[PDB]
Amino acid sequence: DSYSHYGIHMEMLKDCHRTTSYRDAMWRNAYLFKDKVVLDVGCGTGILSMFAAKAGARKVIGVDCSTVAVQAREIVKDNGFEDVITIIQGKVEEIQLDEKVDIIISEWMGYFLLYESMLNTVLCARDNLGTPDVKMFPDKANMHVCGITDEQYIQERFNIWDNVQGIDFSYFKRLSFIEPLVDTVERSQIVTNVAPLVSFDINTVKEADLSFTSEFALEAQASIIYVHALSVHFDTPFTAGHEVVILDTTPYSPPTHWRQTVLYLFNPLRMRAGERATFRMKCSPNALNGRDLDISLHVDFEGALQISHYDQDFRLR
Amino acid sequence: DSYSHYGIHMEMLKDCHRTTSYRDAMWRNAYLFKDKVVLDVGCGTGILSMFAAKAGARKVIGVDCSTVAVQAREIVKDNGFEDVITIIQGKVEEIQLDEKVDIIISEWMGYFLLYESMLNTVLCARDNLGTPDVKMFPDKANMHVCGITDEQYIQERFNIWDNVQGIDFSYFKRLSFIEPLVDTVERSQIVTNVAPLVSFDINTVKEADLSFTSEFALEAQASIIYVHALSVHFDTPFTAGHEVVILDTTPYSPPTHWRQTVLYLFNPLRMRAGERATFRMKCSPNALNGRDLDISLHVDFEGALQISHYDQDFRLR
Amino acid sequence: RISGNLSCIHDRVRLRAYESVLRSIKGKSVLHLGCGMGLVSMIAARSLASAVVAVDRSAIVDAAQVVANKNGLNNISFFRGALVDVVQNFPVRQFDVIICEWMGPFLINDPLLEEALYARNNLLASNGVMCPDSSSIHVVGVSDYCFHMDTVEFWGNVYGFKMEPMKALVQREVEMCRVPTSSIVTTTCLAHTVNIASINNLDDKSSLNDFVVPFSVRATKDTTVNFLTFYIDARFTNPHDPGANFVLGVRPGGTNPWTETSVALHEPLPLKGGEVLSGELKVCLLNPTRGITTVEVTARTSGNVVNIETKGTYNYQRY
Amino acid sequence: RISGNLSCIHDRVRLRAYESVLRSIKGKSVLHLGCGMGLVSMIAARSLASAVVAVDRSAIVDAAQVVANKNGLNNISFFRGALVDVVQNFPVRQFDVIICEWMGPFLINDPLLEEALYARNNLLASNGVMCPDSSSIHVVGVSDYCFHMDTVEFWGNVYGFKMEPMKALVQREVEMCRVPTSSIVTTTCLAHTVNIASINNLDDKSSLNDFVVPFSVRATKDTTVNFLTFYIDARFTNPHDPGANFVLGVRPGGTNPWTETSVALHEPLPLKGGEVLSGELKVCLLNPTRGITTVEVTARTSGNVVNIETKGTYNYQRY
Ligand SMILES: Nc1ncnc2c1ncn2[C@@H]1O[C@H](CSCC[C@H](N)C(=O)O)[C@@H](O)[C@H]1O
Numbered sequence A, B: 001d002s003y004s005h006y007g008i009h010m011e012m013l014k015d016c017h018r019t020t021s022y023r024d025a026m027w028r029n030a031y032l033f034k035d036k037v038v039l040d041v042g043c044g045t046g047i048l049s050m051f052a053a054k055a056g057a058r059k060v061i062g063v064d065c066s067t068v069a070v071q072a073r074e075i076v077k078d079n080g081f082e083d084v085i086t087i088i089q090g091k092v093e094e095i096q097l098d099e100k101v102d103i104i105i106s107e108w109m110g111y112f113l114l115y116e117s118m119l120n121t122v123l124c125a126r127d128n129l130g131t132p133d134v135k136m137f138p139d140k141a142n143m144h145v146c147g148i149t150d151e152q153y154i155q156e157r158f159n160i161w162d163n164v165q166g167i168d169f170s171y172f173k174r175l176s177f178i179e180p181l182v183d184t185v186e187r188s189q190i191v192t193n194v195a196p197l198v199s200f201d202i203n204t205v206k207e208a209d210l211s212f213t214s215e216f217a218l219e220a221q222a223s224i225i226y227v228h229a230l231s232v233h234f235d236t237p238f239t240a241g242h243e244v245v246i247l248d249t250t251p252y253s254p255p256t257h258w259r260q261t262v263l264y265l266f267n268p269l270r271m272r273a274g275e276r277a278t279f280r281m282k283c284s285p286n287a288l289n290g291r292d293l294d295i296s297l298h299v300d301f302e303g304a305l306q307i308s309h310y311d312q313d314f315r316l317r
Numbered sequence C, D: 001r002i003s004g005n006l007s008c009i010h011d012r013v014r015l016r017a018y019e020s021v022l023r024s025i026k027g028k029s030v031l032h033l034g035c036g037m038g039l040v041s042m043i044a045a046r047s048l049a050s051a052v053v054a055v056d057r058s059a060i061v062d063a064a065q066v067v068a069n070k071n072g073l074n075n076i077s078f079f080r081g082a083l084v085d086v087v088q089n090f091p092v093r094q095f096d097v098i099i100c101e102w103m104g105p106f107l108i109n110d111p112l113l114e115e116a117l118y119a120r121n122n123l124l125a126s127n128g129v130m131c132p133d134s135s136s137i138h139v140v141g142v143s144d145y146c147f148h149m150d151t152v153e154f155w156g157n158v159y160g161f162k163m164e165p166m167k168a169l170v171q172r173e174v175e176m177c178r179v180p181t182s183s184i185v186t187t188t189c190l191a192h193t194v195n196i197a198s199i200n201n202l203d204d205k206s207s208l209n210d211f212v213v214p215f216s217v218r219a220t221k222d223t224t225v226n227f228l229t230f231y232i233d234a235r236f237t238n239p240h241d242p243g244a245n246f247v248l249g250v251r252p253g254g255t256n257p258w259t260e261t262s263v264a265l266h267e268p269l270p271l272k273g274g275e276v277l278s279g280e281l282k283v284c285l286l287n288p289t290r291g292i293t294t295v296e297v298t299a300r301t302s303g304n305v306v307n308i309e310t311k312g313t314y315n316y317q318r319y
């Protein structure tokens, strides 16, 4: 309900790549919207509903359980879409519509793609509100991972707790490893190939599939190569249309407001160019808190400089 | 009359510095506009009239002699300024208003500040249409000049005519020196201090003052420095208000659509850091052809490598 | 959660201030309300304080307790939750020193104040002191045309669509954000002061500390003020220990103990150098527990450029 | 005005072509309409042609005459103004070779054609030739979503204001501008051809050369065509001297003898690779002297992605 404040909506709208990705996904495939019913799951200020209307949609339904719906309804009216866009204030799970919707647009992605994400809501809408062939915008979500060197934050965010005014706060250091960091990873930090973490087809994925296992390998590239953390990013291709548009949060692109998610390894990997390290990651919703993420990470690395096979856990809360 | 076509208006509107200079000049001095009558001489698309309206003007009057005024009248209505902005289609010289206007805004500047400029139209509006204390936007105009090296164009625009397919086109080379070049001068070319060419107070200047004489000196700065040409630019300060804004076409700022005017010297000046070359420029509208500019230039340079006292004529047509 | 406490360990100003207070703390009991990570709480315990009861609502105190246990500190106990819900479990219930930063962005609207007053009336010994004990609010004029353009006019057009309704949401909100020095264009004016011994209780009515005070600043240069910014300072004056006094001072444009709050003036105020910007600040606390506050501001020029007066009501919330 | 002739001296394609024609010109008379700077004219005069009469409206001919006089070429004479206004003073009025690029961006909309036809009917010898004698127009589908965004959607909001009325002015204007190779996404269709010997006169009516021709291209890849682009070529075939023939060919995305023109389709046409984009091109000359032209296009997909047909009228002017 913090979306009733203007700061978050401004941040998202000033995220040019994000908003233009949705816009161009619809406008480069406007033929897909002619005479169609569009559901904007979490319409916020209404921006995506208006992109859909401007793309040629017959009817757009922006739903948002925040008070921003009020402002959205007014914005929709101020630009002449009053008779095309309808703004409902309420939860998408607790609302019912006249027709089944042909297209579902939504910026459901959270940090790490799934933390505090509305994906469960979008899937609920897809199943209960969407036609059997309802088209998803985006309809694909791919998470990728790569190793990074981060001497700066290892010294300023972890080792800083070793001594604080002559007191040992090592316990704070150990607790820092549990919580991933949402921040921007610079290209210069990537010391590893980007490997596929996991892929979801939003047309077919089920909530149970979001609790995923992934086995990926990371190869050191370009003389001691330190993998201090794993940078996790995602992209959401809009493959529903003839022209493919891809929203990308990769560090190789300018930062979005999702930036990147950094899982700091309890034991950094000391690799050399060409050596490979295997990883097994399990992500699942937190048992007690539904919207928190438990991440289990198995690191198996054997190289000329280190041999480490350990299990580490993270909790995004 | 080519302003009935969209290209020129897009060029000017996509000129961010020009448009935001007028925008800010008004919105940082909105107190000057409250309950005031504004005249937008040459409103074009109406952009400046709407800036004035948002600044709080009681009444704005945009005049334009081209067909664009039709679109302007529709634009002002599309944004709700119908009851504040009135769009007149016609020459400002040939129209008369009920009240005397308190403020006159206009982008009258051309290449070289005065080539095909509406300055005479603005002075006519200042005298006949505005109150005795009418405020000008911009109310000042300042031209500056500096010497530049341009070996590239000296070889591709002048010396290339020496022999063309076995034919001596040297006459074309001699004629090329008559025609100023409207192009972007990069900082790399400036080998001279920016000197004041001439200044105009739009509150008091008369048409006779626009046929101006200027005596300016140019000093080389930082091998042998060639002054192949003189780069002339201008700036129009908005000093009518408490907050001063300055529209600037200097080559030390990103290019505007005015770029810079390059007067190529028939005899380049061979200088080195410190040496001083004096110039006397007389700019006046061509006796017969009114809207073409005749530029007489007397170059007097005495240095260790050259001694030249010559007169050159340029025709901006 | 751990990263959120880094700002505390790098807060050199607070550390030297509360260190000056914790000199004479040996043998005295300490109640630390809003202890956070408990750094000052543990420093007090390390200063051989008889007993240290540290309270906060965030889970960090649990980690703080662990750290305390792992450092040999045996005279300190942490409690998670609101004071009212933990006093019943308190080992001791009369304290000689009560450390609590009860001052909000407008002096009276920090939810911790409700707890400080409880500690003042029930948990403070007869000769006990409270730290800090006073807080003043300072007003300055700010000129940031580009910020207004990027937060207000930005909604004029968003990818081709007008979002005028959002402008209201921007101008009705008190902005807590560091303001650059280049945007400070007036002198500073101390408008009001509150002292914990005089602050009225809020259990019956939340308005018993609301105040209306004038202010006046002088433009440091020809400018146009379109924001008013409010800085909070804190003072601790101990008559029994005069040397242990401190001041968490205010320096607009620089590092301050609290992030200043700003309000956007609905009509900019153009000023000449030296011209007086006069005004009035009205602060009303509506909900002590959530810090819900209304801030009514009147501000005017002196007429050198133009006579303008502008009013505005702004809303601040802690929780 | 002098700089405008640099393109000519660097145009090696035209240069070697017309040189091939001016080999056998010794002893023959030449009329160069639209001579510009007169480079080809002087190359013909230097080839010991009996007489060379070069005409053009721009003052550059005066400069050209100076050059000709300073290079010893006395068998050449330049005339400024419209052909009809200068034939009165021509030394000879029957020519063996008439060089004139009479072809416009749509084959029939160049004002110089009105002079070419006059020369064909009055100033051409019995066995004289006209160079070039044929011209064809080629159609290609173009995909440039960003150009549409920058030129049409740009007016969606300009500094906070909506300038919708301008969008129309953009989409009804034939744009003359080179199209990048990356935006060429279909084959090339030679849609129409005109020969100077077959072109009808324009003195009475201006519509005697308007043409309506079909076109069909195949998408080179999955794409969405939102622009149609038109390229012009020229050909000279001399039956008496077959070896001197030439072709001012065309290559979309690369250098060409004329800058292509483009029209913005009002509805994009999504195509799969290899899909056929079919359509119809209608060109109408309204004002020969000013080259005012209307260009109507119908363009449709084959349905592999979606059946869409779009139509549009566009305006072109020379002067
Ligand atoms: N379960 C739920 N049902 C309906 N709306 C929800 C929801 N959970 C979150 N939301 C709303 O969905 C929005 C997602 S963020 C809004 C993004 C917006 N489309 C833009 O691009 O600017 C939030 O404003 C929130 O209020």
Ligand SMILES: Nc1ncnc2c1ncn2[C@@H]1O[C@H](CSCC[C@H](N)C(=O)O)[C@@H](O)[C@H]1O
Pocket (backbone or CB within 6 Å): B003, B009, B012, B013, B041, B042, B043, B044, B045, B046, B047, B048, B063, B064, B065, B066, B068, B090, B091, B092, B093, B106, B107, B118, B121
């Ligand atoms: N003598 C004259 N009287 C009235 N209008 C004139 C004029 N000379 C030129 N104009 C008009 O003035 C305009 C100047 S350019 C328009 C700039 C406009 N303010 C903008 O920022 O978009 C042209 O559109 C032209 O049509």
